[PDB]
């Protein structure tokens, strides 16, 4: 879920028209499963959402992806 | 997260000049009719006149503040047409009123005024007549002179004043460039 | 009026609660200041809870 | 008296009896359909002020009981034969016969700086009346 | 409880609801309704909020921060509010539903107001101070929809003569560099001299005073006249007191006499055979500007004045009436002298001339200029969608809710405007990322165009000062969690 | 004649495009093809606006 999200936004400025507002909300709407997982397990809100973007999102010079996108 | 779409509303401001419209048009024309209104002074007074009828009435309504507003302006310059003006701007709001629900945006509707307003002033020129400075008019000046005093009496008393009102300006003031002064002109009641 | 035994102790507590709570944004430098209006309509901006406590208005023995 | 002073004042003059009033709204309808250098968008508004005109002869046949829209036709018939021909020729509503009338004959006028103004003062009066979008209570 | 931080935002936005279309030159016209049956038709923005009564005490602080600002600069004074208040709507659910601590987003405001103004400084565009010419279409701004349109020639003129006269570079890194040091309230302060035409109106360098001759006998031309400045006037503190004090100034046979307080009779006869002419009926707020512009030192005591005064660089003597008043003219300061056709005309200028030269400064003290009607606000925010992807941290939520309050000011111009804002602002955003930042919004058309034909530019110092307020008003507001009432 | 309109307005009204801009645009292409000598026909396109 947080790994179809740089994906989703990247269609998003890609396709013209006014349904660049529904595909950048439609990402969103994505957010609310790993919210609840971390509410449920005593985590705070403010801990893991930022961990899960960090996470995903590097700086790799290659094509080729690399480290662990199974975060 | 609070955000809204922003209502028309307006509404009130359109109908109440839809009620303070009908009280001006049937005053309006030798044909109109005579209305009485008495405020607090114990005295009788009948006037058709538009400027004098909403200063001898309070009104609480914002919206006929600024309609009353109108007609001292154009009694200090112009002095006529004072009911005229009220019911160009009720009427002119209905039309408007209308053309809310289709979306048309008000700044639109003003500025679409002042391009209908610069086409008026090139047909006013080619239909306006010059009228000659001589004094031989004053047959003509007779039928203009009946224009003002049918509205505001029953038609009978106009032909009475209809000499007095045409001999008095040319009596007092000369035909020549100069100017006019009204307060020259004593008034006596009786 | 004369109010003994536990439920005065009670209402005690809850009064020094309510005025504990307001200070409490106040603690420490990266704390959140307050203002305070009084009949006038005026207000004032401090961080310092010491001029606080001497304009807030409470009506209470203990306040 | 007013009315007579602004007879020497200016040597223009406008016949009244609806005269102005619907020779000026007809021709402002046919003027931006021919010539269309305005806009598509704007024209939808300045129709509405071209039948805001109408009204003032529509009234007065209204306080005598006449059917306004019948001396509406009368007249509108009489002006697409003046079109035809090249003369001039002066269209007014006549209250007592009911038929249509010359002002010139009649002796129906009126001022020249009354008209100007009421039209350019009914402009910005009727204009501020809907750039307010809510009304403020404030003060108290 | 959280029941203060709802009020905090509510308040901010009923203050800000009044002025939602009164943002940008189609704004229109509010009615106030008075307790007492008036009503206030004027449709200028921060003249509304000073009678508007406001209950929640969060809405007197933006009443307050909108008053500073009105006196630095003319317009821009609902562009803060607006700004300001769109910021704590998206901020809304993050700091409820959310659970976003309000330092956080404070905070993030910080570093972005950072990065907001890195983005104007290199959307800016060079101009030349020096261009006459320039000039004209950016005062404009303050000049159109006036009275002042058709003297708008002349009215370049008079404000650019006044500026370049009172500025100074003195550049240098020792003591530190004020840009051109401009002054606008001593030097600029303009006073309203009736009579004369606005046409031939010029500039003029010195102090002028309208008090006429106080002797009906004397010579109405004079060579150089030298000002001589006084504290104590000339009077009894009997005949030879006033002439011991009369001596002192004779000592070095003066031939002009200005005094600041009223001058007896006796007096008169004294300095009648100096050769000296008489002024009284002085200002002491003018003293000040007298001593700079002529150089004689102010003294108390008259025993005490210096020799060291000099009537040098004086234009002219002549009293010759102009608009049925004798006045005087002594053309590092100078004096702007409107001259018209009546006082109602003179008092419209006054305050137009004003905030023209307050909007010339701000061209002034910042040679840039940034794209107006909405373009500079829209660029900004693409900008904070690129940057929002490289922070990764928790202040990414909160920064990415400013790109959506960056672009309400283009969408108040479309709300005015009568067209689709959501089809606009799709395809305006658009346009800035291959445009160059050059598209903007046309108002009186209303279709989406670029301004490098129209030529609509702004000054930076207001794009910066807009900014920079704003953020520093939305956190106050998060600054107060708690209210609390009584003495 | 007016109450015939309201359909190519209801069907844009739906779509958020604003119902005067496509008013306009069609009548100013009906003028066009008259003095073109010719037959083509116009309609509302609801994805476009145009």
Same mark, same amino acid.
């Given at each position: 879920?947080?790994?179809?999200?740089?994906?989703?936004?990247?269609?998003?400025?890609?396709?013209?028209?006014?349904?660049?507002?529904?595909?950048?909300?439609?990402?969103?709407?994505?957010? =609310?499963?790993? +919210?609840?997982?971390?509410?449920?397990?005593?985590?705070?809100?403010?801990?893991?959402?930022?961990?899960?973007?960090?996470?995903?999102?590097?700086?790799?010079?290659?094509?080729?992806?690399?480290?662990?996108?199974?975060? | 997260?609070?955000?809204?779409? +922003?209502?028309?509303?307006?509404?009130?401001?359109?109908?109440?000049?839809?009620?303070?419209?009908?009280?001006?048009?049937?005053?309006?024309?030798?044909?109109?009719?005579?209305?009485?209104?008495?405020?607090?002074?114990?005295?009788?007074?009948?006037?058709?006149? %538009?400027?004098?009828?909403?200063?001898?009435?309070?009104?609480?309504?914002?919206?006929?503040?600024?309609?009353?507003?109108?007609?001292?302006?154009?009694?200090?310059?112009?002095?006529?047409?004072?009911?005229?003006?009220?019911?160009?701007?009720?009427?002119?709001?209905?039309?408007?009123?209308?053309?809310?629900?289709?979306?048309?945006?008000?700044?639109?509707?003003?500025?679409?005024?002042?391009?209908? +307003?610069?086409?008026?002033?090139?047909?006013?020129?080619?239909?306006?007549?010059?009228?000659?400075?001589?004094?031989?008019?004053?047959?003509?000046? /007779?039928?203009?002179?009946?224009?003002?005093?049918?509205?505001?009496?029953?038609?009978?008393? !106009?032909?009475?004043?209809?000499?007095?009102?045409?001999?008095?300006?040319?009596?007092?003031?000369?035909?020549?460039?100069?100017?006019?002064?009204?307060?020259?002109?004593?008034?006596?009641?009786? | 009026?004369?109010?003994? %035994?536990?439920?005065?102790?009670?209402?005690?507590?809850?009064?020094?609660?309510?005025?504990?709570?307001?200070?409490?944004?106040?603690?420490?430098?990266? %704390?959140?200041?307050?203002?305070?209006?009084?009949?006038?309509?005026?207000?004032?901006?401090?961080?310092?809870?010491?001029?606080?406590?001497? /304009?807030?208005?409470?009506?209470?023995?203990?306040? | 008296?007013?009315?007579?002073?602004?007879?020497?004042?200016?040597?223009?003059?406008?016949?009244?009896?609806?005269?102005?009033?619907?020779?000026?709204?007809?021709?402002?309808?046919?003027?931006?359909?021919?010539?269309?250098?305005?806009?598509?968008?704007?024209?939808?508004?300045?129709?509405?002020?071209?039948?805001?005109?109408?009204?003032?002869?529509? !009234?007065?046949?209204?306080?005598?009981?006449?059917?306004?829209?019948?001396?509406?036709?009368?007249?509108?018939?009489?002006?697409?034969?003046?079109?035809?021909?090249?003369?001039?020729?002066?269209?007014?509503?006549?209250?007592?016969?009911?038929?249509?009338?010359?002002?010139?004959?009649?002796?129906?006028?009126?001022?020249?700086?009354?008209?100007?103004?009421?039209?350019?003062?009914?402009?910005?009066?009727?204009?501020?009346?809907?750039?307010?979008?809510?009304?403020?209570?404030?003060?108290? | 409880?959280?029941?203060?931080?709802?009020?905090?935002?509510?308040?901010?936005?009923?203050?800000?609801?009044?002025?939602?279309?009164?943002?940008?030159?189609?704004?229109?016209?509010?009615?106030?309704?008075?307790?007492?049956?008036?009503?206030?038709?004027?449709?200028?923005?921060?003249?509304?909020?000073?009678?508007?009564?406001?209950?929640?005490?969060?809405?007197?602080?933006?009443? &307050?921060?909108?008053?500073?600002?009105?006196?630095?600069?003319?317009?821009?004074?609902?562009?803060?509010?607006?700004?300001?208040?769109?910021?704590?709507?998206?901020?809304?659910?993050?700091?409820?539903?959310?659970?976003?601590?309000?330092?956080?987003?404070?905070?993030?405001?910080?570093?972005?107001?950072?990065?907001?103004? &890195?983005?104007?400084?290199?959307?800016?565009?060079?101009?030349?101070?020096?261009?006459?010419?320039?000039?004209?279409?950016?005062?404009?701004?303050?000049?159109? !929809?006036?009275?002042?349109?058709?003297?708008?020639?002349?009215?370049?003129?008079?404000?650019?003569?006044?500026?370049?006269?009172?500025?100074?570079?003195?550049?240098?890194?020792?003591?530190?560099?004020?840009?051109?040091?401009?002054?606008?309230?001593?030097?600029?302060?303009?006073?309203?001299?009736?009579?004369?035409?606005?046409?031939?109106? +010029?500039?003029?360098?010195?102090?002028?005073?309208?008090?006429?001759?106080?002797?009906?006998?004397?010579?109405?031309?004079?060579?150089?006249?030298?000002?001589?400045?006084?504290?104590?006037?000339?009077?009894?503190?009997?005949?030879?007191?006033?002439?011991?004090?009369? &001596?002192?100034? /004779?000592?070095?046979?003066?031939?002009?006499?200005?005094?600041?307080?009223?001058?007896?009779?006796?007096?008169?006869?004294?300095?009648?055979?100096?050769?000296?002419? =008489?002024?009284?009926?002085?200002?002491?707020?003018?003293?000040?500007?007298?001593?700079?512009?002529?150089?004689?030192?102010?003294?108390?005591?008259?025993?005490?004045?210096?020799?060291?005064?000099?009537?040098?660089?004086?234009?002219?003597?002549?009293?010759?009436?102009?608009?049925?008043?004798?006045?005087?003219?002594?053309?590092?300061?100078?004096?702007?002298?409107?001259?018209?056709?009546?006082?109602?005309?003179?008092?419209?200028?006054?305050?137009? /001339?004003?905030?023209?030269?307050?909007?010339?400064?701000?061209?002034?003290?910042?040679?840039?200029?940034?794209?107006?009607?909405?373009?500079?606000?829209?660029?900004?925010?693409?900008?904070?969608?690129?940057?929002?992807?490289?922070?990764?941290?928790?202040?990414?939520?909160?920064?990415?809710?400013?790109?959506?309050?960056?672009?309400?000011?283009?969408?108040?111009?479309?709300?005015?405007?009568?067209?689709?804002?959501?089809?606009?602002?799709?395809?305006?955003?658009?346009?800035?990322?291959?445009?160059?930042?050059?598209?903007?919004?046309?108002?009186?058309?209303?279709?989406?165009?670029?301004?490098?034909?129209?030529?609509?530019?702004?000054? &930076?110092?207001?794009?910066?000062?807009?900014?920079?307020?704003?953020?520093?008003?939305?956190?106050?507001?998060?600054?107060?969690?708690?209210?609390?009432? %009584?003495?």
């Amino acid at each position: 879920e947080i790994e179809l999200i740089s994906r989703i936004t990247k269609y998003g400025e890609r396709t013209p028209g006014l349904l660049q507002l529904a595909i950048k909300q439609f990402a969103v709407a994505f957010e =609310v499963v790993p +919210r609840t997982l971390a509410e449920t397990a005593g985590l705070d809100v403010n801990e893991v959402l930022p961990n899960l973007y960090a996470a995903h999102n590097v700086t790799e010079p290659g094509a080729v992806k690399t480290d662990h996108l199974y975060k | 997260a609070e955000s809204l779409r +922003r209502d028309a509303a307006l509404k009130v401001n359109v109908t109440s000049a839809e009620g303070l419209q009908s009280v001006l048009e049937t005053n309006l024309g030798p044909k109109g009719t005579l209305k009485m209104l008495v405020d607090g002074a114990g005295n009788i007074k009948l006037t058709k006149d %538009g400027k004098v009828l909403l200063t001898e009435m309070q009104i609480q309504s914002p919206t006929a503040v600024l309609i009353a507003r109108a007609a001292a302006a154009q009694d200090e310059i112009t002095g006529d047409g004072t009911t005229t003006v009220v019911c160009l701007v009720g009427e002119l709001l209905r039309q408007a009123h209308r053309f809310i629900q289709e979306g048309v945006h008000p700044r639109i509707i003003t500025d679409g005024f002042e391009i209908a +307003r610069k086409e008026s002033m090139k047909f006013l020129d080619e239909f306006k007549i010059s009228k000659t400075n001589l004094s031989n008019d004053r047959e003509f000046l /007779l039928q203009v002179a009946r224009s003002s005093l049918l509205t505001k009496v029953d038609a009978d008393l !106009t032909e009475v004043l209809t000499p007095i009102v045409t001999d008095a300006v040319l009596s007092v003031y000369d035909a020549q460039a100069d100017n006019l002064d009204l307060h020259m002109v004593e008034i006596m009641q009786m | 009026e004369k109010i003994s %035994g536990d439920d005065i102790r009670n209402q005690n507590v809850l009064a020094t609660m309510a005025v504990a709570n307001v200070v409490k944004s106040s603690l420490g430098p990266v %704390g959140l200041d307050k203002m305070l209006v009084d009949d006038i309509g005026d207000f004032t901006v401090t961080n310092d809870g010491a001029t606080i406590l001497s /304009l807030l208005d409470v009506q209470h023995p203990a306040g | 008296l007013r009315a007579v002073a602004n007879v020497l004042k200016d040597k223009n003059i406008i016949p009244g009896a609806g005269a102005f009033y619907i020779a000026l709204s007809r021709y402002l309808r046919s003027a931006n359909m021919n010539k269309l250098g305005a806009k598509g968008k704007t024209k939808t508004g300045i129709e509405a002020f071209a039948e805001a005109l109408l009204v003032i002869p529509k !009234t007065l046949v209204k306080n005598s009981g006449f059917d306004p829209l019948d001396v509406l036709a009368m007249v509108e018939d009489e002006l697409d034969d003046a079109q035809d021909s090249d003369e001039t020729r002066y269209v007014g509503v006549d209250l007592n016969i009911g038929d249509s009338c010359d002002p010139t004959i009649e002796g129906i006028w009126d001022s020249y700086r009354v008209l100007r103004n009421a039209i350019t003062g009914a402009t910005g009066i009727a204009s501020n009346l809907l750039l307010c979008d809510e009304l403020l209570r404030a003060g108290r | 409880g959280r029941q203060a931080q709802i009020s905090n935002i509510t308040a901010a936005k009923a203050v800000a609801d009044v002025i939602r279309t009164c943002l940008g030159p189609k704004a229109m016209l509010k009615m106030l309704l008075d307790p007492m049956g008036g009503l206030v038709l004027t449709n200028d923005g921060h003249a509304i909020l000073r009678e508007i009564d406001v209950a929640h005490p969060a809405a007197k602080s933006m009443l &307050e921060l909108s008053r500073t600002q009105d006196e630095e600069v003319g317009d821009g004074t609902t562009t803060v509010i607006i700004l300001a208040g769109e910021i704590l709507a998206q901020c809304a659910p993050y700091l409820i539903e959310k659970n976003i601590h309000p330092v956080i987003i404070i905070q993030a405001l910080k570093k972005a107001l950072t990065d907001a103004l &890195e983005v104007i400084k290199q959307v800016s565009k060079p101009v030349d101070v020096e261009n006459d010419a320039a000039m004209k279409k950016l005062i404009q701004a303050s000049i159109g !929809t006036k009275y002042v349109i058709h003297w708008s020639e002349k009215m370049c003129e008079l404000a650019l003569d006044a500026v370049k006269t009172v500025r100074k570079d003195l550049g240098q890194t020792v003591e530190g560099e004020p840009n051109f040091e401009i002054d606008i309230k001593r030097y600029v302060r303009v006073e309203k001299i009736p009579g004369g035409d606005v046409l031939d109106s +010029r500039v003029l360098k010195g102090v002028l005073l309208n008090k006429d001759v106080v002797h009906p006998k004397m010579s109405r031309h004079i060579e150089n006249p030298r000002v001589v400045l006084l504290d104590c006037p000339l009077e009894y503190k009997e005949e030879e007191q006033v002439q011991l004090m009369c &001596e002192q100034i /004779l000592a070095v046979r003066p031939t002009l006499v200005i005094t600041e307080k009223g001058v007896s009779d006796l007096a008169q006869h004294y300095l009648l055979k100096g050769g000296c002419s =008489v002024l009284r009926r002085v200002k002491k707020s003018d003293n000040n500007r007298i001593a700079r512009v002529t150089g004689a030192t102010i003294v108390n005591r008259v025993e005490d004045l210096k020799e060291s005064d000099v009537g040098t660089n004086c234009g002219l003597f002549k009293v010759e009436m102009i608009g049925d008043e004798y006045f005087s003219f002594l053309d590092k300061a100078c004096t702007i002298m409107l001259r018209g056709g009546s006082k109602d005309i003179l008092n419209e200028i006054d305050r137009n /001339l004003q905030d023209a030269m307050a909007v010339a400064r701000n061209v002034m003290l910042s040679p840039s200029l940034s794209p107006g009607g909405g373009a500079t606000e829209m660029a900004v925010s693409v900008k904070l969608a690129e940057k929002a992807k490289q922070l990764e941290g928790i202040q990414q939520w909160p920064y990415q809710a400013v790109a959506d309050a960056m672009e309400c000011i283009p969408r108040t111009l479309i709300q005015n405007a009568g067209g689709d804002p959501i089809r606009l602002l799709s395809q305006l955003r658009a346009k800035h990322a291959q445009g160059n930042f050059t598209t903007g919004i046309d108002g009186d058309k209303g279709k989406i165009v670029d301004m490098v034909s129209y030529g609509i530019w702004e000054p &930076e110092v207001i794009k910066q000062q807009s900014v920079k307020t704003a953020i520093e008003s939305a956190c106050l507001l998060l600054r107060v969690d708690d209210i609390v009432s %009584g003495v």
